[PDB]
Design a protein around this ligand. Structure first.
Ligand SMILES: *[C@@H]1O[C@H](CO)[C@@H](O)[C@H](O)[C@H]1NC(C)=O
Ligand SMILES: *[C@@H]1O[C@H](CO)[C@@H](O)[C@H](O)[C@H]1NC(C)=O
Ligand SMILES: *[C@@H]1O[C@H](CO)[C@@H](O)[C@H](O)[C@H]1NC(C)=O
Ligand SMILES: *[C@@H]1O[C@H](CO)[C@@H](O)[C@H](O)[C@H]1NC(C)=O
Ligand SMILES: *[C@@H]1O[C@H](CO)[C@@H](O)[C@H](O)[C@H]1NC(C)=O
Ligand SMILES: *[C@@H]1O[C@H](CO)[C@@H](O)[C@H](O)[C@H]1NC(C)=O
Ligand SMILES: *[C@@H]1O[C@H](CO)[C@@H](O)[C@H](O)[C@H]1NC(C)=O
Lengths: 172, 44, 198, 84, 38, 50
């Protein structure tokens, strides 16, 4: 707020408009990047109240009704671990943390309920064991391998998720 | 106001109070009526 | 406004060029923005220091423009690399990647020219008119577990058939389209049904 | 809102698709109304351990994707631009 | 007009259109075979 | 003296804006990669190795 600066800058040119346009374009680009990454679907799927996934446990990555900003425990650890005038201002993002978390919840519900069918159109319900059998067939392993070791594979997946949360809790 | 370029007949219509005419970029284009068009230049 | 990306690229280039043109006529602290006027009304020492001021300003503007142009060129190059990848995969073949060549199961793609870009017409397969069915992981027949070769076991009501995943084409459960693997004691959710032997 | 303060638009309690992104989950649309943008249609899928959904029909969908390939090639003569 | 020139593209609009038509014709008449050989 | 200060501060702002543009390009590339990964691994099964 000095008039002499304005007097000496009006004759200097229009660099301020250039910088403002560049910053506005950058901010719009980041909003578009988040929008493209997280909003892969236009329908917010919800996990059914009953959770019978053949022994697989997803309560670790699914949201809980305790209201921790509608985020899973792993998401809570991720948020907690990350630690964050003179004409400088910070524009808030268009998509809030709750909105991104609900997109993530919808993606999880669609993946664990409909497999990959919801990504190609309408969501198609299918038991999680049969979805895993399809995925096993994708990598060239027959379905009977899954079906005769379902408990072992479920336990291995649960243990792997446990090691993931243990690493995210203590290991920096 | 000195400068270089090719004088050209002018079809635009000025006003009695108007002497100069500047197009976009605030450069001299038409001057009391004659048009100022710089001679041909380019790359080789 | 269906070609907003190409129009946006053209608008940014035109805005940058117009901005450079406008900055050509800035005083930059000099007595005038016209070089010829300065030369025709000043002593060579003061004329050359004003020339130095104008040269500094215009060179700074040109430096800024060239840097923005390089950044935009890198962005356009990345987009063109993506377009070439899409041409090679979606147009010259069939891609199994999800949503790389359009929403849904990709069938083919067609290229169309654009003034400063390309247009891909992605032809895709989208399932529709869905129906509910009852499934079973396998069938326990004669104390043996039968799994489908390709497809899934379904049963509107009681009658058990085998169909394919992406379309409802029920078929009679038969030893040709089913394979046996072990007994029916370890599979969870197995049901009892007859298997036709042709 | 946490993005500032808006004057001239009537706040509504509904949720529509975002038209003019104000920020922080707030959008505006045309009087001018301001709301919280809706993420999309809310539906619950009927999941069961012995139930599947199989399509009985198909749709051939043609979509258009636009990709810039190049921009205008501009050459600047520095001596002519700076000095003339 | 002040040292600013626009260099024309090497490939004209007609030639790009001919490329697109050839690609589309090969796709219709041959599928993906033309992208991997004859 | 004020004019000299104006030139220096504007130069600093240009450097900051250029760095932000380069970082934004890098973050945009990373976000494009993340969107591709989400599309091809969350919405389906990917046969690509690693
Ligand atoms: C999943 O794990 C959590 C914590 O380890 C546990 O409280 C929950 O009961 C488990 N779910 C099932 C279905 O076992
Ligand atoms: C069939 O599935 C749909 C979801 O696609 C569900 O709304 C409907 O209730 C199911 N049918 C029955 C009889 O439950
Ligand atoms: C299932 O549909 C088939 C097709 O007509 C039929 O043969 C069978 O009886 C049906 N079962 C029931 C319970 O509707
Ligand atoms: C599905 O879950 C129910 C419990 O709600 C159980 O009674 C039934 O046996 C299960 N069926 C299969 C095939 O796992
Ligand atoms: C299938 O039949 C066998 C013997 O025929 C019987 O032991 C078994 O309980 C039957 N399965 C069911 C689900 O009733
Ligand atoms: C506020 O929102 C609630 C729930 O959407 C609605 O019932 C109520 O009518 C709204 N009130 C106003 C003044 O918009
Ligand atoms: C599929 O939809 C088309 C129209 O979109 C319809 O003509 C056709 O009969 C449908 N298929 C079946 C099996 O009903």
């Amino acid at each position: 707020d000095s008039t002499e600066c304005s007097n000496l800058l009006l004759q200097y040119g229009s660099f301020c408009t250039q910088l403002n346009r560049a910053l506005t374009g950058i901010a719009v680009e980041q909003d578009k990047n988040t929008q493209e990454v997280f909003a892969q679907v236009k329908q917010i799927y919800k996990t059914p109240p009953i959770k019978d996934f053949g022994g697989f446990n997803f309560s670790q990555i699914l949201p809980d009704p305790s209201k921790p900003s509608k985020r899973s425990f792993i998401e809570d650890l991720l948020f907690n671990k990350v630690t964050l005038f003179n004409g400088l201002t910070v524009l808030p993002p268009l998509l809030t943390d709750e909105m991104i978390a609900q997109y993530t919840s919808a993606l999880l519900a669609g993946t664990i309920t409909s497999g990959w069918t919801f990504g190609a159109g309408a969501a198609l319900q299918i038991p999680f064991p049969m979805q895993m059998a399809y995925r096993f067939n994708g990598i060239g392993v027959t379905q009977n391998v899954l079906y005769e070791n379902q408990k072992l594979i479920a336990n291995q997946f649960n243990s792997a998720i446990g090691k993931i949360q243990d690493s995210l809790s203590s290991t920096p | 106001l000195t400068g270089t370029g090719v004088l050209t007949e002018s079809n635009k219509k000025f006003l009695p109070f108007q002497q100069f005419g500047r197009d976009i970029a605030d450069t001299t284009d038409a001057v009391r009526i004659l048009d100022i068009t710089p001679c041909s230049f380019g790359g080789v | 406004s269906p070609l907003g990306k190409l129009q946006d690229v053209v608008n940014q280039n035109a805005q940058a060029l117009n901005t450079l043109v406008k900055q050509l006529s800035s005083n930059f602290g000099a007595i005038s923005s016209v070089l010829n006027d300065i030369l025709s009304r000043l002593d060579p020492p003061e004329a050359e220091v004003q020339i130095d001021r104008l040269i500094t300003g215009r060179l700074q503007s040109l430096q800024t423009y060239v840097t923005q142009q390089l950044i935009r060129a890198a962005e356009i190059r990345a987009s063109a690399n993506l377009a070439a990848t899409k041409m090679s995969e979606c147009v010259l073949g069939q891609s199994k990647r999800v949503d790389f060549c359009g929403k849904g199961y990709h069938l083919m793609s067609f290229p169309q020219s654009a003034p400063h870009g390309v247009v891909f017409l992605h032809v895709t397969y989208v399932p529709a008119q869905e129906k509910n069915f009852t499934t079973a992981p396998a069938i326990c027949h004669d104390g043996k577990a039968h799994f489908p070769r390709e497809g899934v076991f379904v049963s509107n009501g009681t009658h058990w058939f085998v169909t394919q995943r992406n379309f409802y084409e029920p078929q009679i459960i038969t030893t040709d389209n089913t394979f046996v693997s072990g007994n029916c004691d370890v599979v969870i959710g197995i049901v009892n049904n007859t298997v036709y032997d042709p | 809102t946490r993005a500032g303060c808006l004057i001239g638009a009537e706040h509504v309690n509904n949720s529509y698709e975002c038209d003019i992104p104000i920020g922080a989950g707030i959008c505006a649309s045309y009087s001018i109304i301001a709301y919280t943008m809706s993420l999309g249609a809310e539906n619950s899928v009927a999941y069961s351990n012995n139930s599947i959904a199989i399509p009985t029909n198909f749709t051939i969908s043609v979509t258009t994707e636009i990709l810039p390939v190049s921009m205008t090639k501009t050459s600047v003569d520095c001596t002519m631009y700076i000095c003339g």
